[PDB]
Motif scaffolding. Structure first.
Motif, PDB file in Angstrom:
ATOM      1  N   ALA A  19       0.869  -1.176   0.000  1.00 55.19           N
ATOM      2  CA  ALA A  19       0.000   0.000   0.000  1.00 55.19           C
ATOM      3  C   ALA A  19       0.907   1.227   0.000  1.00 55.19           C
ATOM      4  O   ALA A  19       1.570   1.512   1.001  1.00 55.19           O
TER       5      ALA A  19
ATOM      6  N   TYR B 274      -2.678  -0.283  -4.154  1.00 53.29           N
ATOM      7  CA  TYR B 274      -2.150  -1.624  -3.934  1.00 53.29           C
ATOM      8  C   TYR B 274      -1.483  -2.110  -5.214  1.00 53.29           C
ATOM      9  O   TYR B 274      -2.066  -2.006  -6.296  1.00 53.29           O
TER      10      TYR B 274
ATOM     11  N   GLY C  37      -6.333  -1.740  -7.818  1.00 51.32           N
ATOM     12  CA  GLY C  37      -5.369  -2.760  -7.492  1.00 51.32           C
ATOM     13  C   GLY C  37      -5.601  -3.987  -8.340  1.00 51.32           C
ATOM     14  O   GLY C  37      -6.586  -4.082  -9.076  1.00 51.32           O
TER      15      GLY C  37
ATOM     16  N   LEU D 134       0.211  -7.926   3.208  1.00 47.91           N
ATOM     17  CA  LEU D 134       0.024  -6.506   2.949  1.00 47.91           C
ATOM     18  C   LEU D 134       1.132  -5.737   3.651  1.00 47.91           C
ATOM     19  O   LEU D 134       1.232  -5.780   4.879  1.00 47.91           O
TER      20      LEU D 134
END
Ligand SMILES: [Cu+2]
Ligand SMILES: [Cu+2]
Ligand SMILES: [Cu+2]
Length: 439
Positions: free
Chosen positions: A23, A40, A46, A61
């Motif tokens: 991120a 993302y 994303g 993540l």
């Protein structure tokens, strides 16, 4: 590249989708202009994650944002210990989400932040992507031979090469943007090669609604947020509220150019007016009509037959409890409530029993539309506004216009602490959220 832009797809391999996703503030070209978004995987939207039932998802993540963040696996009936609405990933830190895709599952889902108080700016800035669960039903000829596309409907406003900041009025209404985009593209052209299109639709906007209509064509609804209908349902238009998904078949009827539009829709957004001793709130009225994409039909289109049936909807056990949740507003304070309370992460509001069915009556006593979302536990909408729902399918967001009551059939699945909230994410950040504990 392809005339119709879609997010890059990442597929599970050998039953495992193992992926690291950062991120990060990302310089991009967006709608013909350069801007820095929060993304993302370096893209807006994303990447689309495409999996099958029983696959393992292992998504790490990494938070490269200056503020904490997390993920909500919107629509996935998994454990709230994985889809954890209270988890905070600090800046610079990582977290691995690991779950198995449930066996009885199909459709279009998505992922986005769910850190209370910070969702609206993070989602507006570009942090979202789709997740598609393939189904053995996708092999039936009437679907396999269709031309499939994902349409991520998300608007944006830019200021100084960045997402425009939230104003006080944005926190009251939910922020909408002037750039009304499909897959991060401004009014793309879809040059169809087949006469039947299978369109997966996602409203990933903070607050904007899409009253979808294709010029000269009906749409055939085949899936709601969380699964297939029992059979295709012909509709003249289809309203997608924030957080909702749908899948439709389009049967192109003749050669030519057909606009896919978001028709005017009044969701109850408010402005302010001063006319001499006034200084009162005034309805914004319906949205201006937007063209979403240009659909070019092929030559001599001969659409496939529609499938006669899709997926039988499960017979649910008789329910053991009825809930009543009432939504209200304090517009000038930009405060929003469920049963008179704002969210408190330490307060359990409902306690239910796993593997029982509940009836939830959600009543909108405000004047704005409120799209009500429940994590972890997909529901069957029985009726909204006193009108029975014309199909049976799993949903996880239900839109309520002013005054309307939705009656939901809510089978409780995974045990643990989860949340329910308005998916005008500004309203969630401003208190319109509660806590459900399943034991
Ligand atoms: Cu969501
Ligand atoms: Cu949520
Ligand atoms: Cu709301």
């Amino acid at each position: 590249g392809p005339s119709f832009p879609e997010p890059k797809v990442v597929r599970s391999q050998g039953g495992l989708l193992s992926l690291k996703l950062s991120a990060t503030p990302t310089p991009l070209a967006i709608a013909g202009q350069r801007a820095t978004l929060l993304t993302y995987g370096g893209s807006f939207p994303g990447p689309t994650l495409r999996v099958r039932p029983r696959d393992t998802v292992r998504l790490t993540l990494e938070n490269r944002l200056p503020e904490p963040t997390n993920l909500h696996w919107h629509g996935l009936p998994i454990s709230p210990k994985v889809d954890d609405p209270f988890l905070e990933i600090p800046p610079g830190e990582s977290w691995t989400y690991e779950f198995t895709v449930p066996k009885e599952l199909a459709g279009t889902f998505w992922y986005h932040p769910h850190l209370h108080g910070r969702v609206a700016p993070q989602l507006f800035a570009g942090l979202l992507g789709a997740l598609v669960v393939e189904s053995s039903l996708d092999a039936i000829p009437e679907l396999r031979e269709a031309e499939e596309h994902l349409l991520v409907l998300k608007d944006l406003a830019l200021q100084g090469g960045r997402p425009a900041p939230h104003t006080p009025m944005d926190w009251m209404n939910g922020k909408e943007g002037d750039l009304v985009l499909v897959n991060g593209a401004l009014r793309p052209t879809l040059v169809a090669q087949k006469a039947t299109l299978r369109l997966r639709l996602l409203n990933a906007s903070n607050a904007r609604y899409y009253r979808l209509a294709l010029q000269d064509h009906p749409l055939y609804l085949i899936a709601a947020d969380g699964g297939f209908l029992e059979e295709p349902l012909e509709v003249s238009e289809l309203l997608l509220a924030p957080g909702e998904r749908a899948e439709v078949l389009v049967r192109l009827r003749k050669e030519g150019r057909f606009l896919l539009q978001a028709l005017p829709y009044d969701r109850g957004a408010m402005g302010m007016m001063d006319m001499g001793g006034m200084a009162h709130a005034m309805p914004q009225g319906p949205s201006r009509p937007e063209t979403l994409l240009y659909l070019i039909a092929p030559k001599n289109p001969k659409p496939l037959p529609l499938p006669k049936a899709l997926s039988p909807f499960p017979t649910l056990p008789a329910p053991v409890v009825t809930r009543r949740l009432v939504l209200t507003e304090d517009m000038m304070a930009a405060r929003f409530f469920i049963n008179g309370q704002v969210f408190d992460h330490r307060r359990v509001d409902l306690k239910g029993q796993a593997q029982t069915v509940e009836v939830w009556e959600v009543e909108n006593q405000g004047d704005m539309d409120h799209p009500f979302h429940l994590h972890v536990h997909p529901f069957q909408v029985l009726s909204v506004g006193g009108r029975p729902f014309p199909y049976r399918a799993w949903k996880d967001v239900v839109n309520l216009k002013a005054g309307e009551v939705a009656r939901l059939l809510v089978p409780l699945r995974e045990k643990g602490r989860t949340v329910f909230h308005c998916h005008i994410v500004e309203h969630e950040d401003r208190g319109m959220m509660g806590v459900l504990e399943v034991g």
